[PDB]
Design an enzyme around this catalytic site. Structure first.
Site, PDB file in Angstrom:
ATOM      1  N   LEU A  18     -51.234-109.890   6.627  1.00 26.18           N
ATOM      2  CA  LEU A  18     -49.992-109.354   7.164  1.00 26.18           C
ATOM      3  C   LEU A  18     -50.101-108.995   8.639  1.00 26.18           C
ATOM      4  CD1 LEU A  18     -49.102-106.926   4.206  1.00 26.18           C
ATOM      5  CD2 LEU A  18     -48.129-109.208   4.591  1.00 26.18           C
ATOM      6  N   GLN A  20     -52.496-107.967  12.469  1.00 29.22           N
ATOM      7  CA  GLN A  20     -53.534-108.394  13.405  1.00 29.22           C
ATOM      8  C   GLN A  20     -53.744-107.348  14.493  1.00 29.22           C
ATOM      9  OE1 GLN A  20     -51.508-111.980  14.480  1.00 29.22           O
ATOM     10  NE2 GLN A  20     -52.311-113.093  12.685  1.00 29.22           N
ATOM     11  N   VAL A  26     -54.982-106.434   8.673  1.00 26.95           N
ATOM     12  CA  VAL A  26     -54.261-105.868   7.533  1.00 26.95           C
ATOM     13  C   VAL A  26     -53.875-106.992   6.581  1.00 26.95           C
ATOM     14  CG1 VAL A  26     -52.056-104.888   6.788  1.00 26.95           C
ATOM     15  CG2 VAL A  26     -53.386-103.753   8.586  1.00 26.95           C
ATOM     16  N   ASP A 138     -47.125 -94.268  21.497  1.00 30.47           N
ATOM     17  CA  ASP A 138     -47.145 -95.726  21.424  1.00 30.47           C
ATOM     18  C   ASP A 138     -46.095 -96.229  20.446  1.00 30.47           C
ATOM     19  OD1 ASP A 138     -47.797 -98.432  21.407  1.00 30.47           O
ATOM     20  OD2 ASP A 138     -49.773 -98.164  20.495  1.00 30.47           O
TER      21      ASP A 138
HETATM   22  C1  LIG Z   1     -42.242-110.339   5.746  1.00 30.57           C
HETATM   23  C2  LIG Z   1     -43.087-109.454   4.834  1.00 30.57           C
HETATM   24  C3  LIG Z   1     -43.995-108.579   5.691  1.00 30.57           C
HETATM   25  C4  LIG Z   1     -44.381-108.956   6.969  1.00 30.57           C
HETATM   26  C5  LIG Z   1     -45.216-108.119   7.701  1.00 30.57           C
HETATM   27  N1  LIG Z   1     -45.651-106.983   7.183  1.00 30.57           N
HETATM   28  C6  LIG Z   1     -45.269-106.610   5.958  1.00 30.57           C
HETATM   29  N2  LIG Z   1     -45.654-105.492   5.388  1.00 30.57           N
HETATM   30  C7  LIG Z   1     -46.449-104.624   5.951  1.00 30.57           C
HETATM   31  N3  LIG Z   1     -47.105-104.745   7.090  1.00 30.57           N
HETATM   32  C8  LIG Z   1     -47.824-103.637   7.201  1.00 30.57           C
HETATM   33  C9  LIG Z   1     -48.681-103.177   8.180  1.00 30.57           C
HETATM   34  C10 LIG Z   1     -49.288-101.946   7.994  1.00 30.57           C
HETATM   35  C11 LIG Z   1     -50.167-101.471   8.936  1.00 30.57           C
HETATM   36  C12 LIG Z   1     -50.787-100.304   8.872  1.00 30.57           C
HETATM   37  N4  LIG Z   1     -51.560-100.221   9.954  1.00 30.57           N
HETATM   38  N5  LIG Z   1     -51.420-101.244  10.628  1.00 30.57           N
HETATM   39  C13 LIG Z   1     -52.172-101.455  11.877  1.00 30.57           C
HETATM   40  C14 LIG Z   1     -52.474-102.938  12.186  1.00 30.57           C
HETATM   41  C15 LIG Z   1     -51.255-103.822  12.468  1.00 30.57           C
HETATM   42  C16 LIG Z   1     -52.230-103.448  13.602  1.00 30.57           C
HETATM   43  C17 LIG Z   1     -50.557-102.081  10.050  1.00 30.57           C
HETATM   44  C18 LIG Z   1     -49.061-101.176   6.866  1.00 30.57           C
HETATM   45  C19 LIG Z   1     -48.214-101.643   5.882  1.00 30.57           C
HETATM   46  C20 LIG Z   1     -47.602-102.868   6.068  1.00 30.57           C
HETATM   47  N6  LIG Z   1     -46.774-103.528   5.289  1.00 30.57           N
HETATM   48  C21 LIG Z   1     -44.448-107.390   5.183  1.00 30.57           C
HETATM   49  N7  LIG Z   1     -43.933-110.314   3.983  1.00 30.57           N
HETATM   50  C22 LIG Z   1     -44.697-109.484   2.994  1.00 30.57           C
HETATM   51  C23 LIG Z   1     -44.992-110.337   1.746  1.00 30.57           C
HETATM   52  N8  LIG Z   1     -45.590-111.507   2.331  1.00 30.57           N
HETATM   53  C24 LIG Z   1     -46.899-111.737   2.387  1.00 30.57           C
HETATM   54  O1  LIG Z   1     -47.684-110.956   1.849  1.00 30.57           O
HETATM   55  C25 LIG Z   1     -47.409-112.907   3.229  1.00 30.57           C
HETATM   56  C26 LIG Z   1     -48.795-113.387   2.819  1.00 30.57           C
HETATM   57  F1  LIG Z   1     -48.777-113.890   1.591  1.00 30.57           F
HETATM   58  F2  LIG Z   1     -49.270-114.233   3.730  1.00 30.57           F
HETATM   59  F3  LIG Z   1     -49.575-112.311   2.758  1.00 30.57           F
HETATM   60  C27 LIG Z   1     -44.615-112.340   3.048  1.00 30.57           C
HETATM   61  C28 LIG Z   1     -43.363-111.473   3.293  1.00 30.57           C
END
Ligand SMILES: C[C@H](c1ccnc(Nc2nc3cc(-c4cnn(CC5CC5)c4)ccc3[nH]2)c1)N1CCN(C(=O)CC(F)(F)F)CC1
Ligand SMILES: C[C@H](c1ccnc(Nc2nc3cc(-c4cnn(CC5CC5)c4)ccc3[nH]2)c1)N1CCN(C(=O)CC(F)(F)F)CC1
Lengths: 629, 629
Positions: A18, A20, A26, A138
């Site tokens: 999810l 980077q 993540v 941020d």
């Molecule tokens: C569109 C939706 C989506 C997109 C981006 N993020 C989330 N959801 C999500 N993003 C998160 C990030 C954090 C998080 C916490 N800390 N950080 C720090 C680091 C970023 C720098 C990030 C916490 C909870 C989070 N939930 C969901 N998706 C989820 C189900 N799909 C997959 O799973 C794709 C697969 F199959 F390819 F996997 C495809 C559809």
């Protein structure tokens, strides 16, 4: 589908990625014994600087940090084979705010309802984090997550706090943090601008490129109380504005409240700029206000009255005045088919129920020019024959983002048109009420008066200077009936204008503009879906980076069709929706000038019946009121 | 992605398979030089019986067969390597009617709007095919395709016609075609029943299984004018009904028109059953009618008045009577806040504009019991611990299909509740009008009358048996004021009941039921989406037939969650939505009985002012009208 790691209680595939970010990745994972989804933060490249006591200790702060707008961190475990500490956090299945603003629908800002959810939850979560000591500094669209709550409304939730101690976004930095209880609020303002506008506040021509030297002096210019600075020409000039753009799909009502917030949190001088106490106080005032929908029928505009539930109706009429330029004395109201009247003491919570579909119309005695709907006229961007994966994904969001605006305006114009239809329909029936109300106040006079002249003739019939006095009362009592004869007949002129086929017929409302049966907003959305599905495929094709010959030809046919849809929908927007709205608007101008005339004529006629109503009661008391022993 | 064939102009992958059927397979393909999508019908197993002259000849009939509801066949080409003749037909990207009815939302029938699209297009396409000679005899949900038209509304399109010559569906056969210009219309009726109901007309306990021997005598029973036969017990009895079920989400208005159609096209005896001329004539009458929405405020029910645009308002009131049991003389109307009055000659096209949201309310002088909304009380099916791929896909449609009904009822109950709120709000303001209208008709009498008694005292003051006659006029002229004094005061009793805080306050409407702010229909749909996404995955898992251990555990966790969502949503439907609707309904019963009383009291008071209005004009003419030379 083949490789991915696991811990004592959780597991995750590696393709299931999810997020980077240099410290960690993540992944979408699942608890083994339950199958329940969590976000899994794995720390690659961590081996140079992992202090066991400190790092573990601060996580226990965030472990038990419960709040609606904070992405909960459930457990801190260790990975089986690589001995990497892994974080188990809430999986927010909707993505992030950035994900939201990437949808073409939000190219020119979020919907008003959705924008307030952002404000509420961003301000609410952050205030909670400051209360417990933690800071963020941020707040960026990308580190604000989203879940669909139990009532279906979004709930935004912040992450990425408290990592600057261990070791943010270049597009969200402060005039001194480019090359501190207030510095957090700049990135905030940038975010709240971005959510409202659809695009960022401060931007050079080449952007945040190698030519990002421009951006520093744009940011540090801090002119007047401006909120945006944009140079539209290479090596060119930076246009400033302390106001939202026209493309902004946010009510005038709210803009007038949000502009001061963003203007005072987007400055350099520390003593000049706001603080989280001032800021959290000011944003509260926005979110604690209720919205009364007022349709200024006379000027064909719709408004949102951002009033406090405890505010008096004397304030409400002042608010309306700020938007409609109508005076509280002159402001008239109509609601659900009937004149609405508002005592000043009445509280806002005890007003009637309003919606965009069914609002409180506002009429006036004085005249007003009819502005109509005031939108931004955006032409389609350029579709080039170049095969470019990244510049076709970029173009697809834009071109579709314009069509969403064109399909947005198309619907609002129809709301206006149908609301005018509705508001006008009541008004003629409510002016018809006054002509029929006057007739009964007229019989109240003409019958009594033309029975009184018979009585003065009946006085000389039963039972000289006094006979000459009788005829003088008699003639002037018949001189009342002379202006009474004209008033009754010139009233029947209003009868014709009001009655079907007359001069004030609403016949045109029904046969000049566009209608919900025309299905023109439905028609557009069809093409909009064609375009948007292509956009997401072009977004996916951006990720692949290379493409097969068969797919290559596809993305070359589909891009060509993305223009044909766009121009097909665009011709329909202007040459059908806009034009026929303009035709209805222009015709409306005439009915208002024509109807206002009637509303000053019918009044005089009535403000005259009141006068020969006075003169009959006064003179059915002359000889009827004489005396003798 | 690796293998698939091609022809001179078109090409298609083999995984890209849309359809299945012994003569041929249908694949999603693309024209080579354009990239445009078509449906591609390839004929496997064709080698025993391909006659070049005949087969090619009849295709040229269908080549140029253009119509809105017929799936066009563009070209007949030959395959490159296998020398198989391939058909190039319109790709209908939405699937088929069957695909539609598989969605849980349509488990208990299609939406009314959508059902008429089916009727219109199925009847319209077929009539066109009969005109040109071709017959089908096999109209089935699965061979009726669907495309989203340019206005966003569906457009259904038939295929699979004229293949019975070369060489249909067991669930759609006739009492003599189990083991002919009318026989087509049985399968039709079965289809039109299925689209309206959500399930088939005639069904045994085990179904169309090895135990399908029951089905023949069910179909050939042809009792009375029945439309459905269902045996709910093994080896049990076949319940008949000549009417639609309660779960049917179709207006009473339409049912009363559709039931005769289906009843007369679902029979055995040929001379008894309808013909396509009779049938196409009868269905036209349905589709040429407009719908007026009438909310019977008194009985808390909503109706659709299926009237002809040329029909007179005298017919309209008869129609309403058939649904509300209100007499045309007693039927009263309210519209957009104002009493609506309807001359009999007026045509239906010149009625006002209606919607479910904003309809024509109907009030009465006479009393009526309040039925409320009348829905089917469906409990959740059984969730078994068995791991079964096919019986978990089957269960998932069902359990979710019930929650769609529960989420459907939940919204209609709210429409009702909010429509009652609205209709009641106007009615009190419209009864308040009558009390304030009477006061002016009262001053019209009391002022004139209490000025006339002064005049009879003024007569004896200026200028015996005739003096004894004066006092007799005087006393009986003051005897009018005696009943006038009571009438003025007992009117002020209605002032209290009507005025805020009184006995006829609508205060309860606002604080007893559920509201759009409660977001209870939004709340349910959240869980509904959770359930429906599982259903489609369980539908996909049905296709895989075998599953990995990790996926196996998933589909075992997700199925368990499909029950928890279902029961979670169900408790909320009954223990919150239903209960608080019942509470609002019961409280409404009292206000109607209380308000009806006022509406017979206030009338008498007025039908009495009319009487002492007569007696003053008559007796301000007694001594005022005497004579002498
Ligand atoms: C569109 C939706 C989506 C997109 C981006 N993020 C989330 N959801 C999500 N993003 C998160 C990030 C954090 C998080 C916490 N800390 N950080 C720090 C680091 C970023 C720098 C990030 C916490 C909870 C989070 N939930 C969901 N998706 C989820 C189900 N799909 C997959 O799973 C794709 C697969 F199959 F390819 F996997 C495809 C559809
Ligand atoms: C859900 C929808 C769908 C499903 C079923 N049919 C159609 N559309 C369609 N079905 C048709 C059938 C005929 C047709 C004509 N004659 N006959 C006779 C034989 C049936 C006995 C059938 C004509 C046009 C038709 N259009 C579309 N899909 C289409 C795009 N998706 C694919 O492509 C899947 C892939 F990638 F796997 F391909 C996935 C989503």
């Amino acid at each position: 589908s083949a490789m991915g790691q696991s811990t004592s209680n959780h597991l995750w595939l590696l393709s299931d990625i999810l997020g980077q970010g240099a410290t960690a990745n993540v992944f979408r994972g699942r608890h083994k014994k339950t199958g329940d989804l969590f976000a899994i933060k794995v720390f690659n490249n961590i081996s140079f600087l992992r202090p066991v006591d400190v790092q573990m200790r601060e996580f226990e702060v965030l472990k038990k940090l419960n709040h609606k707008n904070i992405v909960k961190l459930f457990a801190i475990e260790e990975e089986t084979t690589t001995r990497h500490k892994v974080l188990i956090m809430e999986f927010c299945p909707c993505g992030s705010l950035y994900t939201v603003l990437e949808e073409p629908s939000n190219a020119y800002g979020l919907p008003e309802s959705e924008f307030l959810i952002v404000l509420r939850d961003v301000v609410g979560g952050m205030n909670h984090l400051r209360e417990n000591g933690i800071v963020h500094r941020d707040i960026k669209p990308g580190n604000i997550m989203r879940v669909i709550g139990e009532d279906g409304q979004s709930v935004y939730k912040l992450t990425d706090f408290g990592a600057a101690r261990e070791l943010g976004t270049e597009e969200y930095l402060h005039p001194d943090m480019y090359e501190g209880a207030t510095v957090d609020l700049w990135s905030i303002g940038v975010t709240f601008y971005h959510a409202a506008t659809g695009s960022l506040p401060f931007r050079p021509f080449e952007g945040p490129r190698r030519n990002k030297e421009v951006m520093y002096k744009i940011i540090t210019g801090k002119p007047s109380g401006a909120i945006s600075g944009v140079q539209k020409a290479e090596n060119g000039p930076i246009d400033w504005s302390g106001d939202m753009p026209v493309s902004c799909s946010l009510s005038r009502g709210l803009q007038v409240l949000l502009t001061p917030v963003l203007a005072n949190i987007l400055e350099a001088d520390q003593e000049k700029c706001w603080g989280f106490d001032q800021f959290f106080a000011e944003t509260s005032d926005i979110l604690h206000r209720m919205v009364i929908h007022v349709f200024s029928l006379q000027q064909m505009t719709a408004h949102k009255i951002y009033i406090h539930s405890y505010n008096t109706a004397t304030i409400f009429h002042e608010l309306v005045y700020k938007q409609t330029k109508i005076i509280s004395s002159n402001q008239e109201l109509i609601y659900e088919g009937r004149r609405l009247v508002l005592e000043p003491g009445r509280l806002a919570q005890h007003f009637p129920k309003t919606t965009e579909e069914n609002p409180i119309f506002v009429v006036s005695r004085e005249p007003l020019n009819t502005i109509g709907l005031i939108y931004e006229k955006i032409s389609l961007p350029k579709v080039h024959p170049r095969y470019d994966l990244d510049g076709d994904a970029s173009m697809a969001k834009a071109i579709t983002g314009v069509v969403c605006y064109a399909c947005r305006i198309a619907s609002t114009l129809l709301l206006y048109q149908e609301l005018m239809r509705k508001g006008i329909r009541w008004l003629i029936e409510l002016i018809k009420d006054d002509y029929n109300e006057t007739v009964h106040k007229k019989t109240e006079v003409v019958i009594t008066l033309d029975f009184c002249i018979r009585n003065i003739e009946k006085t000389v019939k039963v039972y000289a200077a006094e006979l000459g006095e009788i005829s003088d009362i008699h003639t002037k009592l018949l001189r009342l009936s002379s202006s009474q004869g004209t008033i009754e007949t010139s009233l029947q002129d209003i009868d014709s204008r009001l009655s079907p086929g007359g001069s004030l017929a609403d016949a045109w409302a029904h046969q000049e503009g566009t209608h919900p049966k025309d299905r023109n907003v439905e028609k557009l959305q069809v093409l909009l879906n064609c375009m948007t599905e292509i956009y997401y495929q072009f977004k996916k094709d951006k990720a692949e980076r290379r493409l097969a010959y068969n797919e290559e030809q596809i993305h070359k046919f589909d891009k060509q069709k993305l223009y044909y849809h766009a121009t097909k929908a665009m011709t329909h927007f202007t040459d059908e929706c806009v034009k026929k709205y303009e035709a209805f608007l222009n015709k409306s101008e005439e009915w208002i000038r024509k109807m206002l005339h009637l509303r000053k004529q019918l009044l005089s006629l009535t403000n005259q019946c009141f006068d020969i109503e006075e003169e009959v009661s006064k003179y059915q008391e002359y000889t009827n009121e004489l005396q003798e022993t």
